Structure formats: C-alpha cells, structure tokens
Amino acid sequence: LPNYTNLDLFHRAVFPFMFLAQCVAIMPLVGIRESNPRRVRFAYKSIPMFVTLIFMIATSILFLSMFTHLLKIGITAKNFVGLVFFGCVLSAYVVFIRLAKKWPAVVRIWTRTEIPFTKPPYEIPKRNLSRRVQLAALAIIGLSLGEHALYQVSAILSYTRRIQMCANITTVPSFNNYMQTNYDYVFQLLPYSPIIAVLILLINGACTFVWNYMDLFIMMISKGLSYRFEQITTRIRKLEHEEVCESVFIQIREHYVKMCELLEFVDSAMSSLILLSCVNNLYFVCYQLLNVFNKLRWPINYIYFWYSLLYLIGRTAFVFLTAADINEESKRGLGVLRRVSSRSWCVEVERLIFQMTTQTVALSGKKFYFLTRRLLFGMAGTIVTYELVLLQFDEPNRRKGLQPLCA
Amino acid sequence: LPNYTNLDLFHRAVFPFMFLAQCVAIMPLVGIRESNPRRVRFAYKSIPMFVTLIFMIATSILFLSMFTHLLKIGITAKNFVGLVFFGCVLSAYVVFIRLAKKWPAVVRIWTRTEIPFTKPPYEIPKRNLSRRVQLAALAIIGLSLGEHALYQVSAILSYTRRIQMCANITTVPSFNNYMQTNYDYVFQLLPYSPIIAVLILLINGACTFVWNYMDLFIMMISKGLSYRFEQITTRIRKLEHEEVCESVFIQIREHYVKMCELLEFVDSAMSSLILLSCVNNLYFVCYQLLNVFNKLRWPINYIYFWYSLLYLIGRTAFVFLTAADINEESKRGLGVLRRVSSRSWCVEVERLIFQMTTQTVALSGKKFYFLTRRLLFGMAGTIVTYELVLLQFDEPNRRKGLQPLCA
Amino acid sequence: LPNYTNLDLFHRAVFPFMFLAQCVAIMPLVGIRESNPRRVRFAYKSIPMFVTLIFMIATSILFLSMFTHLLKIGITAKNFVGLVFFGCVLSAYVVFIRLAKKWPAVVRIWTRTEIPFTKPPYEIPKRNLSRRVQLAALAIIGLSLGEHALYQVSAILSYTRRIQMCANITTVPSFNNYMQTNYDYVFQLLPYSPIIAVLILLINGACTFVWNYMDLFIMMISKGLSYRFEQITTRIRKLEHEEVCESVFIQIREHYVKMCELLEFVDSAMSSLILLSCVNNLYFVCYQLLNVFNKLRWPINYIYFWYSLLYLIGRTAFVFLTAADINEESKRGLGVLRRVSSRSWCVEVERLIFQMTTQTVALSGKKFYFLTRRLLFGMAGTIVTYELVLLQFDEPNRRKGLQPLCA
Amino acid sequence: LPNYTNLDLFHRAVFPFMFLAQCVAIMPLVGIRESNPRRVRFAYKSIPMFVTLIFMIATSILFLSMFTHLLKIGITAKNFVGLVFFGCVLSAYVVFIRLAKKWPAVVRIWTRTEIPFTKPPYEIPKRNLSRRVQLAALAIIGLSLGEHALYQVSAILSYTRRIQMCANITTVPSFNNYMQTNYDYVFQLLPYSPIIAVLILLINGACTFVWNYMDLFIMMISKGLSYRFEQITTRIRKLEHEEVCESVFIQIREHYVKMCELLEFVDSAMSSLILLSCVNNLYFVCYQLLNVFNKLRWPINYIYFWYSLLYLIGRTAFVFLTAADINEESKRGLGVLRRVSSRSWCVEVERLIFQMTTQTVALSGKKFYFLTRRLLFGMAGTIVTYELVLLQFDEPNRRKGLQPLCA
C-alpha cells in the first residue's frame, strides 16, 4: 500500500484544519488525523459527536434567546439578521454532520483516485496541495479572527463611550454590564452569571468560525480537485510539440474520467453545504450592502462594518472563484489538445476533446447551479438588482439617522 | 400479446388515480380501469363526459358568482385571486378534456415503448413504478386534504369567534349563517338552500382537488418517464467494467431513442397542462408570498396560511423536480458511457453519447421552456425579484393592519 | 427555365401583399407583380419611389405637427407615445426602402434555392405556401382594419357623447369640429381644410397599415423559410423505416445547407426590420399594459383599448412564433435522423446531425438575438418585470381617475 | 527576418496611437515607435515611466481635491460621479502600466502569429489593418475632442451668462474667477495660480483622453484580431466550389488554432482593462441616462449633455461590437466549411468545424463574461432595468427643477 505519511494527498493537506474545525465540533469524524484515510470513520458514539451535540445545544439556546428577544421587542428586517445567522449556523452543523456521514467513502475514493497523480508523468507544481490549502485556511482564519476582534473592539468602545460621554445615567462600565447590555437577548431568558457570559462569548466565536469554515471547506475541496485537474493540464501541455502515442492519450482520458467521477461524488456529498453557503452569503451580502449608506457613530464602527462587508464579499467571491477554477482548469487542456498533430490524432483524442468541451466540469448546488465565473458574474448582477430594488425599502430607515446617544 | 394484468406498466400504476380524478370529472376517458390500455377510448357521449359537463357548469356558476360579487364590491388585486382560481380550474377542465382526447394514442405508444423494459437485461428497481406513483399521489392527496381541512377549520373558527367575542350584534352561529357569510359571493346571485350549500362545498373541494391534480398528474407522468430512463441508466451501469459488443450498444441506443420519442409525444400532449400549471403556480406563489408579512387574527389562521404557502411552494418545486428527473437520469448515463474502453468503443457509442450530450431530454411547456433544475432555480430567482418589486406595492395594504373584529 | 406562373414559390405567394403594401408605398420595387422574380428591380426614378416619397413627406408632416403640439402642451410619457408611433412609421419606411434595395438579390437567391423543393422527392403539404401566406395576411389585415374601425368608432362616439351630454357649451357636432378637436395637433400647425382632413385620415390609416405590415412581412418571410424546412423534415420522415443510400443523405444535407445559406441571406437583409419591429412592439406593449388599470368613460373605449392590446400582444407573439417555427422545424428532423439504422449510418448523416444540433437555424435581429421560443418566453418575462417596476410609476396617474366630462 | 517597415502588421498600425497615448503617459513602453516589435521593452527607469508617474501624481491630486470638496459639502450620488471618474482614470493608469509590463511578449507573439497571414494564400482586404485602426482612432479622438470642446463651451457660456444676466453681485467675468468657480474643488485645497489653472485644465483633458483611450485601445486590439480572423474566413470562402486537399485544411486549422492562442494570450493580458472599461461605462451610462429628464438652463447645456450621452453610448456599443466581431468572424467560416464536398471531407475539416462550433472565440473580462452581441443585448436590457428601477430614486431630484440663476 502507498505511504500516506509523506505523499502529497488531499487528506494530508486538509486534515489539520478538519481537526481544527472538530475542536469547535463542526465535522465529527473519528481518526481524522490518521495518515491513512481508510481509518477515518463516522460514529455517533464518539467524542466528536458529543462535542457537536454540546455545540448545537448551545447554538440552539442562543437561537431561542434571540427568537424570544425579538418576539418581545418585535421582529424587523434589521433584527431578523441575527436570528438568520444563528439558524444558518445550526443548519451548517447538521449539514456537516451529514457530510461526515458521507466523508469516509468520499476520502477513500479521493485517495484511490489521486494516487496515479502522485507518480510520473505527473509532477508536483511549485505550490503543492498542502501549501495551497494552508494559505487559503490561514487567510480565512486570520481574516475571521480580525473581523471578530474588530467586532468586539467596536462594541466595547461604543459601550464605554456611550456610558462616559452620556452626561446622564452612568451605570459605571464593567464586564457584567457590558454582557447584560450588548447580549441582553441572552440574559433576558437565562439568569446572568460570569461563567455563562464566557460561555456565550465562546459560542458566538464558534458560530462565527463555523460561518467562515463552510466557505473555507468549500475552498479547500475546490483546491484539491483543481490541483489534479491542473496536473492533467500540465501533463497535456508537456505534449504540445511531440508525436504522442495512443496509449498516452488513453491514460490521460482515463485519469480525466476518474477525476470527473471523483468531482461528481464530491459534488453529491457537498451539494447541501454549497447551497447553504451560497444562499446565506447572498442574503448577508445583500443585507450588509443595504447598510452602506447608514450612518454610524464612531470611526471604529465604520471600520468594523466595512471590514466585515469587504471580507464577506471577498470570501463569497473567492469561494465561487476557487470552485470555478475546476471548470477553468478542465477547459484549459482543450487549447493544448486542439494543437495535436494530424499524425497523433486518434479516436481517444476526439473522445477527450468532446468530453472536455461538452461536459460541465464544475461543482454544483444540488445541480440547481454550477459554480462558474458565469455564475459569479450573474450573482453580482442579481445582487446589484436586489440592492437597487431594496434601497427604496431602506430609504425611510436611512433617513431616520443616528439616534441620540443619551437615548 | 403481453399480460397487462401483472406487468409493471405506467397505465397499471396510474389508472387508479386517473379514475379517482374521473370521480370529480377531470379526465373523461372510457375504460380507464381496463388492464389493456388499448381499450382506453375517449367518447363525448359517455358518463365521464356528462359528469365533466356537470362539474364545468358548477364551476362556471361559481366563477360567475365571484365575478358578480367582485363587480358589486369592486375588483382589487386581493379579491381577484379567487376569480383567478376559478378560471384556472375551468381552464384545467378544458385542458384535461383535450388531454383525454389525446390520451388513448399516448398510452398506446407508451405501452408499446415500455414493453422492452419489462424484460431483461432491464431490472425492476427497489421501488417499482406503481409504488412511486402511489407514494406521490398519496402524499399530494393527503396534503391537499389537510390543506382543505385546515381552511375549513380556520374559517369556521374565525366565524364562530367573531360572532361570540363580538359583544355586539350576535347572529347566533349556524351552518346557514356561516354559508351566507363566508360564501356570500354565491348566494348573492342564487337563492339560498341547504342543498345548494352542500353542493357549493363539494364543488369547492372538487376545484381544490383539480388544482392539486394538475400537478399530481404532471408528477406521475414524469415518474413514469424517469422510470424507464433510470432503467436504461442502470443497464448501462451494469456494463461499467465489461467488454461490450456492438449489438448491446445498438439495443441501448434504440431503446433510448424510443424513450425520447415517447417523451416528445407526451410533451406535445401535455404542453398545455404544463404551461397552465406553471403559470398558475407562479401567480399563486407570488400572491401568497406577498401576504407573509400580513397580520392575521387567530393562530389557526396563521397555521392555515403557512401550511398552504409551504404546500404550494413544495408542490411547485416537486413538480419541477420530478420533471427534471427525466433530464438528470438521461444525463446520468453519460458518465458511465464515457468510461467505455477503447476496445468496446464504436460508432454506436459515439452516436449515443452525442445524443445524450446535445439533446435536451426534458418536458417542456409548449417548448416555451424546459423543466430542468436550471428552470427551477431561475423560477426561484424570478419569484424573489417579483416579490421584492411587489412588496412595495403591498406596503400600504400591509400597514393598514387588522380590521376591528366588531366591524 | 422553370415556369414561374404555376410553381409553388415564395414570390408568387407574397407578391400580391407586397403590391398591396406598395399601394401605401411601403416597399418601392418595380415589377413586383411579374411572375419571373428576375424582373424585380429597385429604381429610385420609379412610380413606387415617388409614392413612397409622398408618404414619407406626409408622415413627416404628421410627426412635426405632433412634436410642435407636444412642445406647446409639454411632453409627458403618455403623449410621447404618438410621436413614437410616427417616428417608428418613418423608420419603417426607411428600413423598407433599404430592404427593397436588397430585395432583388434576395428573391433571386430564394427562387434558385427553392426550385429543388418544387420537384420530388419533396411534396407540397396540405396547406401550400400561397395558402399559408394568404391566411396570415388576411388575418393581420382584417384585425388591423377592425382595430382602426374600432378606434374611429370609439373616438367619434366619445366626441359626440361629450358634446351631447355636456349640458354646457355645445359646439354642435360636425366632421369639421371633430377633425379640429381630435386631430388638433395637426391643424394647430396647418390651416384647416376638408381636403386636408381626408388626407390626414388616409395617412393615419396608412401609418397603421405600415405598423402592422412590418410584422406581417416578417410573418410571411418566416412562413416561406419554414415551408422549405418542413419539406426537408417531411422528406427525412419518409425514410424512417428504410435503408437509405449515401446519395440521399448527400442531397438532403446539400439542400439543408442551401436553405441555411438562404436563411442567413434573408436575416442579413431583414435584420433592421426585425430589430425595429421587436423594439417598437415591446415599447407599445409595455405602454398599453401600463394602462390596463386606467379608467375609461364609455364601454366602446374599453372595447377598443382591449381589442388593440390583445391584437398587439398576439401580433408580437405570432411574429416571434412564426420566426421560431424555422428553428423548431430545423430541429424536428433531428429526431428522425437519430433513428437512422447502423447500416444506413455514414459520414453524411453525422455531418447533418451535427449541423442541425449545433447550428442555431433562426432569424435574428442583427444577431443581437435569435427569434426562438426561448426568446419569446424571455420577452414575456422581461415585459412582466418592466410592467411590475412601471406600475409604481403610473400609480399617481392611475389614482387621478377620469376627468370631468364637461372639463 | 521579415521586413517590418512595409509589412501589414498590427504593431505598425497601432504604434502611432500608442505613442500618442504615451504623450499623456498612458502605456509607458520604450521603443514603441520602432519598426521591429522585438525592440519594444518595458522599463521602470525610463522617460515614459516618469511622465506616467507625473500624470498619476496630478490625477491623485485632483482625486484628493474632489474627495475633500465633497467631504466639506457632503457626498451625494450626483457629486460622487466626479470622484468615480478620477478614480477610474487612476485605475486605468495602473492597468495600462501592467499592460505595458505584459505588452512586449504580447506583441512579439502577435507578430510571430500574423506573419503567415502576410503571405499567400491570404490577401489584404480592401481596408487594411492600418486604415481600419486609423479610422477608429480618428473617430474616437475627434469625438472626444468635440465632447471636451462642448463641455468647455457650455461651462464658459453658463458662467458668463450667470454673471451677466444676474442683475445682482457681478464678479466681473475673468479666467481667474471662472477657474475659481467651476473648479473650486481644486483651489479649495491648493492656492490659486494661473499656472496651476493651466495645469488643471491640461490634466482634466488628459483624464478625458485616458477615459476614451481605454475603449479605443480595446477597439484597436479587437480590430487587429478580427483582421486575421476575416483573412481566414476569406481564404475558406475561396474554396467554396473547389476540391480541397487535406494539406490546405491542415494549414487552415493550424492558423486558426494559432490565432485562437493569440486571442487567449491577448485576453489574459487585457482582461483587467476590459473589466474596468465595461464597469465604468455601465456606471456612467446609467448615471447619464438617469439625467435625461433633468432640466438644464441653456440650449448649449442640452447640446453638450446629449452629445456626451450619445457618444458614451455609441463608444460602449462599438467597443462591444468590435470585440464581438472576432466571434462573428470566427463563426462566419462555419457556413463555408459546412458546404465542403463529401470527397474533400476529412478528419481535419471535422476537427476545424467542431472547434469553430464549440469554442467561444471572443475577448472576455477575466472570463467573467465574453464580449459578444449576446452580451451587448444583455447589457442593454440590464441598463434598461436599472434605469427603470433608478428613475424612481431620481424622481424627487427631478421634480426639484432648475435652481434660481441668482442663487
């Protein structure tokens, strides 16, 4: 059997971040850190499942608290966003549980499909799969950490400045008062306690990490698939000015078909996650874009709002772009194959060219759409239209202006 | 001739529900319950035609009553919905009459096309055609029955509670007063009578059943076609790792072409019904989605409204999905055919792959559109845009709020 | 040379209505009524060109009168429509002049391309080209005549009823007063005279006839092309269950390619007319649909408005449908060709199937779009969206209501 | 080596206007005027780079001045346009710098790809590449010069007429007062000086020239590519009625594949410029179309506004059309290739036809869209929808009307 310890495989590249997500109980798989992907199993009676259950219970407590708070103060389009966030987090938990159910088989087939690409005539690119996945994951994690830090900083600064510059009722600033004020939706349903406060903060951070990790996981999977597609494209490029025997084309076509089968399997496994991520990101992007013209009090509030908006837009765009890189790389080999000489031309090249040309090699949201650059441009246009229609809805709220600091 | 009594055929699977619809006079065909589909005939001078005429007369009476009531009280976008409902029911009646005119030939060709799939190398799946059609029909019928029961319960509860908690003019609750109040649009044109009341209730139930049965019939037809397409896909799958003779591919291609011809014939027969169902469902989905933010008095009213909205959305989505299952199953065999070895590759496989790849195997609304997952996603986007644009229209009505119970 | 007197050719079918349009000076061609299409020539120094110049001068006088009237009374979206109408008529005149410039060559190639289809193995359908063109032209002409008669009847009835039921300033009804009132935009710039009145009425009728004849001409051309495409489809159908020699497929492919070349030539010649008709019909359909909810005084006004709206919608839809019949008929032969046996299969059938499948055989508006059923459905959706967005614009005008009859 | 002095090459056709743009420091390339394209190099330490840096510094000064002026007077959708203009100019500068970085290799490959087309069997069309590029560049430059002259004339006339017909505070007209009034956004941040005034005027002219030159450069590149594609189409046309040897088809296919490779390279180099031009033109077209109904004081203001709007719309449309001419010319050869006789038919013709039919030969905005006539029609529809949605936004501003001349 192949030596998984040092081989450039998708599992070896992705399992560190899979375990990091397991720490906040996203994808409860047993033995995810094992070098051999065959040892990855899904078990309900396991520590990851227990941590996942605890996290869903906490997120459901938060969701119920938000729901009751909104019901007491009424539900408006602006407040609903928080409830939507919590609901999406819960949905992501469930989706990831199902994905873990499907993940052993997926990773097994992935390994048995990517072994041929670990040996010649395929070559490791300048940036290996592990490095690409590491860069993407570090970028997303650091950006999310900065977003959460800016959120906390802006909230704390607004609270302290409101209390200090009020020239009215003081309520001397404190951690307990901050928790009871900014997170009143929680303690209105549960009795306050500092331990509960720390738990609420940690679970909110976990919810944010889950929200970002859906997109990050999609990015890593797309990177893994486009890695092998780019390897195929490079191997084809190596035959640009050579007379190619039919066996070479047979092997190339077989490997391409195997990669397409793996892509179909992964798409079937990940369709629910792709759908949830796309719809949630679209909704949140529209909601935040509707608030660009809104007036905020402190410069830190503007900084946080614009950082969050730009990071959300970039994360959605890069999810779509990494997914569409599969399609672009699949199509890139067509240009090289079209240069095949008449002497090297045969039935296998015709089959491969027809498949590349007519088959849409791309991830899909339950086949309700395919993640391509066409889809990203269409999404941008749809967002523009929705924002144009909705800014008229938001005009009355926009003209309300900033509320008095004392009030 | 083949023994139709125990053979797994579409007619044997669908005729029970065709007869059930005939009971409310939807599709007036003679001998629909006969095991031999060749005995199914359409005759104007027949009992089903007479019951159909009676039902269209009753529905036209209801339509005229609604029209006169709206004219007396003025036509608004909110009231127009009822008139639209009645008109759609009448249109469905006419469409189904034409479909019955076309149905003998259709079923005949269907039978003569599906006989090859009843014998090897084709195998009956885990869920046979009869079971799939039964599950779909039972689900739709039960959901529609629950919707109508919730409608009646909510209306009766609202009427009784309005009369009781009025602290004003009483008009002691009774069946006659309920009929004269909730269905005042009828008795304003015809003299009241309890027999007329029972007739009105029965005809309203029949109209609801027709509205649901258009979608149900589309679902059953799509199930029947996708059944044979899935049989073809499974037979192809059985040759994944075998050297296939040219005769096998010839037979597969011939059966696929015959199934495509049957699909074209059925689409030509059912294009009007598909168009009517799609347009009616789109209009009603938009209308009901426009009322999600409206305020209702009793929790039973909310329960009925949300049950009806969710059932309508799910029924439209599942009609589109069952229709698109034909396209998905037709495309599913392409992945297996692409794995055909170079030794088994021949002209027949090339022809079949080209046809699968370039031919859009899907039901269509008079070719004005094709029922695919692409079409369902586009429909969802169009509904979102229409609702965004229309909620501004509905804002003045939304802010009116609940009327006084006494008034 | 072939005997054009009794041959079933497009020129013989269309020249009567071409001459009828020439009577109002639409397409100024010399010798359009000659049996031999080679005798059709375009000459600036000809009687048709003189009548065309006279008609453009009259239409320009009307356009200037409308422009000055609107400038004196201000330009609003509701009045602009008349100016747009006149401008479109002038544009149609110019376009048709250019089309006549291109029409000799077009008709020549058409004849030299349709001669093969006048002899076996091609057969004349049940409805020959002349009968189809006659039916379409008679339908359009009669509907336009009824529309204009209803317009005049409604205007005269409104004028007479306003004068009679005023109980105020009388201005006893007369032809001169009616002309000065309803067509005040003309006589405000030119001195009144009964001869001028008759000229204005005749030129308005001519403008309406031109507006309808653009669509009618598109319909006749689409009928002519789809006639030969249907002949090809029928010839292919005749080989469903026969072993076909390669020469038959060679001839079929050659004739199909020649028909495609003729379609490309006709599309190049008629692209400007198609674009103008599409844009004008879209604008007018949107404008009239915006007025469905407007309140009119007399039932005759409602009758005229709804007749005009329904006729406009049906004319646009049937233009698109007749144009798309070319594409549908081109695609219809694919189903038959796919049934070709393995023994009769050859390179020619593969070429023909690939061309049918991948070539979009359809008329186009300068290739800015292709007239297909897809395009008609998209146009309907776009009109729905535009009307939804514009009814909010029209709400203030809609709520104004009917003006006082006396005022 | 080939004699570049008199050869009909893209570099010889385009370098005069490249140098003209270099005069305002758009594309800083060294030796752009050399006959040999191999001598074109990009160097940071060069005079063009220094002039480019000076121009970006001046444009950044203008951008900061506009930003500070808007911040002092508040930012509104109407004023933001100027800031957007300046930002777009800066972005264009950066993009063109990167394009120059990529331009040596691009032009080298272009030359080595277009040498075969300078010799038989390829023929120079009636209008050579140099003449086409000259016509396009002269048209764009003259239209932009007229637009700027009309802008200056309208501004000066409005200023002088406001001062003269005020019957109030005079501020006798002068160049200094005009500069301080119309360009108050600049001198509010920098001290006034006539030299600074001349510099501001020159830099504004340079910004306008850059804005137009992005589109002009796209047009010239599209002309260059469509030139060779049209040469290929003409060569194919020359074989319409001849028996063609396989070697001729091999050469045609090889040249077509080389042209497609060159198009892909140029698209990769120019994707950023295409994206920027498309988005900027869309935004400005929408903004100016939103102001068609606005009321202007003097007829010269209307003349300038409508000249600018029509020129902008035509420039965008012609950019899209020149880019799509590549696709249209690539597709034009398919009709001729489909007429190839059965005896001349071979594998090479099949390959070429499949490539032409299934490959989208067109420029693209980073593959986020392809510049086709389909894309132009979609852009027109999107602009119509956006304007319909936005005119409701602009209604309050439209009804404000012209401000008092004195105020």
Curated annotation (Swiss-Prot), chains A, B, C, D:
Expressed in Gr5a-expressing sugar-sensing cells. Changing residue 284 to A: Abolishes sucrose- and maltose-induced currents. It is found in: Cell membrane. Changing residue 151 to A: No effect on sucrose or maltose activation. Residues 102-133, 223-269, 325-372 are cytoplasmic. Induction: Expression is increased by starvation. Residues 66-79, 157-196, 294-301, 393-407 are extracellular. Sucrose binds at residues 82, 147-148, 185, 208, 304. This is Gustatory receptor for sugar taste 64a. The keyword Heme does not apply. Homotetramer. Keywords: Cell membrane, Membrane, Receptor, Transducer, Transmembrane, Transmembrane helix. The gene is Gr64a. InterPro entries: Gustatory_rcpt. The keyword Ubl conjugation does not apply. The lineage of its organism: Eukaryota, Metazoa, Ecdysozoa, Arthropoda, Hexapoda. Pfam families: Trehalose_recp. GO terms for molecular function: ionotropic sweet taste receptor activity; ligand-gated monoatomic ion channel activity; sweet taste receptor activity; taste receptor activity. It comes from Drosophila melanogaster. It is a multi-pass membrane protein.
